[PDB]
Write a protein that binds this DNA or RNA. Structure first.
Ligand SMILES: [Mg+2]
Ligand SMILES: [Mg+2]
Ligand SMILES: [Mg+2]
Ligand SMILES: [Mg+2]
Ligand SMILES: [Mg+2]
Ligand SMILES: [Mg+2]
Ligand SMILES: [Mg+2]
Ligand SMILES: [Mg+2]
Ligand SMILES: [Mg+2]
Ligand SMILES: [Mg+2]
Ligand SMILES: [Mg+2]
Ligand SMILES: [Mg+2]
Ligand SMILES: [Mg+2]
Ligand SMILES: [Mg+2]
Ligand SMILES: [Mg+2]
Ligand SMILES: [Mg+2]
Ligand SMILES: [Mg+2]
Ligand SMILES: [Mg+2]
Ligand SMILES: [Mg+2]
Ligand SMILES: [Mg+2]
Ligand SMILES: [Mg+2]
Ligand SMILES: [Mg+2]
Ligand SMILES: [Mg+2]
Ligand SMILES: [Mg+2]
Ligand SMILES: [Mg+2]
Ligand SMILES: [Mg+2]
Ligand SMILES: [Mg+2]
Ligand SMILES: [Mg+2]
Ligand SMILES: [Mg+2]
Ligand SMILES: [Mg+2]
Ligand SMILES: [Mg+2]
Lengths: 100, 63, 51
RNA sequence: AGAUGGUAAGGGCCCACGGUGGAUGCCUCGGCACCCGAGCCGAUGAAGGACGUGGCUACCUGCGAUAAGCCAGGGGGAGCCGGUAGCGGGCGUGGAUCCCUGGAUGUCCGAAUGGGGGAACCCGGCCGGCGGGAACGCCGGUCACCGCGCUUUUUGCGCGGGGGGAACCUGGGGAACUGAAACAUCUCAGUACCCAGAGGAGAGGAAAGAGAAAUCGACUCCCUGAGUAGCGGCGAGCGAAAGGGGACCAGCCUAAACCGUCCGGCUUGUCCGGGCGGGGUCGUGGGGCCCUCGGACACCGAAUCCCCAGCCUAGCCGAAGCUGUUGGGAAGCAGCGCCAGAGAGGGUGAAAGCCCCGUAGGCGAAAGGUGGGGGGAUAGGUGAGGGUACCCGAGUACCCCGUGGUUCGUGGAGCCAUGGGGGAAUCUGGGCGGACCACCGCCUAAGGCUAAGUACUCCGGGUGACCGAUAGCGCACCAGUACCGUGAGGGAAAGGUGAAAAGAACCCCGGGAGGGGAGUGAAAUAGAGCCUGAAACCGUGGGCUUACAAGCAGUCACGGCCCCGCAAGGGGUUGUGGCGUGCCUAUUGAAGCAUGAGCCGGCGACUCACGGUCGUGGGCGAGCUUAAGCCGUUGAGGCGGAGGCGUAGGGAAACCGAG
């Protein structure tokens, strides 16, 4: 509980470091470690694979998780905090001064 | 906590208004049999002390 | 000590006896503006005593 | 004939570099302390356990054969199938996972309770079901004991009890060391411990009180009274009360006389007794019965019950920034802005009010727990005068013998309690006011209940001139564990890679281990019990040095050799000469053949509380100062003269007083 945070799975900007300013859709969000997967931080893994099954695994430089605080949501206007407004029924969330 | 006044000493010694201690003359109750009228009279009056005066002060302090 | 302290700060010439308070409500902007015209640029710590 | 460089099997000193080892620094989920909140659980089976449960499960956690969980009501709004990745297979906006409330299931042990028992095992009776099911086995329900009321009897029916709890609480028992510089009375102490009981508290409690005021007015706790009164082998020591000031505030039911009634007993009566109802509850004495009053409408009003506010048990909203600049990484530096009832704190690759979480401020409950805070109802309760003299708590008061409590140790020894013996009275009664008498005066025993103020902290929260892994709880880490004991019981060590695992693919030596490349990284003497890495201790390389030498190992001088500097000079080494009895403790005296220390590193010893005494800084000064506590605050101060020290001493005291 309360583990919830900023954004979810959608468009997001990154003001981190090695990939500052960059932008991309957040494909994953692990709340336990409080970090999300985007398209910025991507490091090369040399390991063949931990599991013997499927001989080749990949020297892949896949996406590495990223602290969910360095990433910020976005809309028509670039980079905005998050306000919330209970709809005429539900509970949607509006940006700095616009909808959704 | 709270120094207890030495009752054994108060019942037998009163301090002067100044700072001196006074008590009755010793030897006058038992040894008696037929001593010179001087002795018995000399023993009638109280007296001052010296160093141990300070000692007995440190008892009747709250008093 | 209390009076002496007050008398000290006053002797230096800092004990101001205000009364006018354009600060209608609990809004910092108002005070910051009131203090600005009060001669309080913020370059000095102050003990704002008031009821 | 003479003279004097070289030589190192090894050793020494110094310098560089590594190994070992884990000090120091910094870090902190943990711990400590205080404050506030909250406070019982159990035969509807508790506390605490055993066994079992995941597709693959060793342990922890969760759960209980429906066994990482099932049903429903809320909360929440994208992810989820615990720590836990991987093989393998799924769930989620038709709103899951998670959190809060209720419910269901809940093996076997355990108060354990059908019986037995070496706890988690073994064996049954009664009813009903299952398998062909009479022998066998399984499943559901049920059967322990004790207490009280019902049951006329027997047997049954119902209600309760049992056990657990860190500390606190009451009652029944109850030490010794130690102090007294011995010891025996005393002290330690009614403490430790044992035992039974009670619940968020317990106890105590509406005067047979206190004690001298022709006064106060239950009880409990805090100031004070006071180290006073007293106690005491008058030794060591022990140690009240009244009164004043505060918190809190609360007062009630019954026994008896007397009336009705039901039951059974007999010596049959106008009665004895038991059960129930009415009546009655007092110390200006009260009540009963009869008479008179008009004696009814109101007046009092719960501690019990009903509704509600509020509160705990999940949560939600929530102001304000963007580009440059150095870097592995901005939040640092710069430039130009903004919010603030929010500039507390935490995180984000480093140093952030405006990035994330928050904070100020303000929202929220279907359900469950609390709730006189507010309101409502019910119980119960309210008067006068005269007469009558009926009643007012029994092996009790009272007295004596033995004793405990109290400040009271037999003291002149009362009072409160009571093991033994004797043993009354009912207001012309009876206790007490410190032996006794008298007078004056307080109070109504021998029946019970009563909130609050008070104590404690297993549990939750907040805070800290509290610790920071040899500290802090014994335990920051799967610790009451490993290990040690037959058993009570004893009881450790052990934390840190990095911003991210990007945890080093692939080649080479090798059996492996471990290395050398390469690669990741800002960093690899950050490379895996891996941050910082001190010291003892081990080792290689280099400078100087030593095989005719005698010693607390050093110091003083000269010289040679090696190294830094423009020079003079400074550093390392030691050839020769001079001089020289280690440290500590204990002692009249130690180099001592007196004690202690193998070496390094870390933990380790004059504190605090209250009271006293002198000095001292500072405020006030015949005055000075407040204590509990109330108000305020949320790291604010203020009020509060009850009380204490001082202004007069002297005497044993009556008393007198600059004497
Ligand atoms: Mg004479
Ligand atoms: Mg005094
Ligand atoms: Mg080397
Ligand atoms: Mg259980
Ligand atoms: Mg299995
Ligand atoms: Mg698992
Ligand atoms: Mg019958
Ligand atoms: Mg002894
Ligand atoms: Mg002895
Ligand atoms: Mg005693
Ligand atoms: Mg009580
Ligand atoms: Mg109090
Ligand atoms: Mg007291
Ligand atoms: Mg004592
Ligand atoms: Mg009655
Ligand atoms: Mg009545
Ligand atoms: Mg006595
Ligand atoms: Mg008796
Ligand atoms: Mg009574
Ligand atoms: Mg009570
Ligand atoms: Mg510290
Ligand atoms: Mg053994
Ligand atoms: Mg390093
Ligand atoms: Mg030299
Ligand atoms: Mg020694
Ligand atoms: Mg000797
Ligand atoms: Mg000496
Ligand atoms: Mg020696
Ligand atoms: Mg010796
Ligand atoms: Mg030795
Ligand atoms: Mg002192």
């Amino acid at each position: 509980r309360v583990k919830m945070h900023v954004k979810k799975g959608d468009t997001v900007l990154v003001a981190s470091g090695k990939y500052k300013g960059r932008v991309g859709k957040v494909k994953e969000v692990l709340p336990k470690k409080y970090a999300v997967i985007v398209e910025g931080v991507n490091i090369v893994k040399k390991a063949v694979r931990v599991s013997p099954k499927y001989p080749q695994g990949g020297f892949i430089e896949k996406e590495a998780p990223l602290h969910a605080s360095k990433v910020r949501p976005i809309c028509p206007a670039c980079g905005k905090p998050t306000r919330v407004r209970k709809k005429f029924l539900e509970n949607g969330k509006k940006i700095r001064v616009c909808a959704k | 906590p709270k120094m207890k006044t030495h009752k054994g000493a108060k019942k037998r010694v009163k301090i002067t208004a100044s700072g001196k201690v006074v008590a009755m003359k010793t030897g006058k109750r038992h040894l008696n049999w037929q001593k010179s009228g001087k002795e018995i009279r000399q023993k009638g009056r109280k007296f001052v002390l010296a160093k141990p005066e300070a000692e007995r002060i440190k008892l009747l302090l709250p008093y | 000590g209390l009076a002496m302290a007050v008398a000290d700060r006053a002797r230096e010439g800092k004990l101001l006896l205000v009364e006018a308070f354009a600060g209608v409500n609990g809004k910092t902007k108002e005070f910051l503006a009131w203090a600005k015209e009060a001669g309080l640029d913020g370059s000095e710590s102050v003990l704002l005593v008031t009821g």
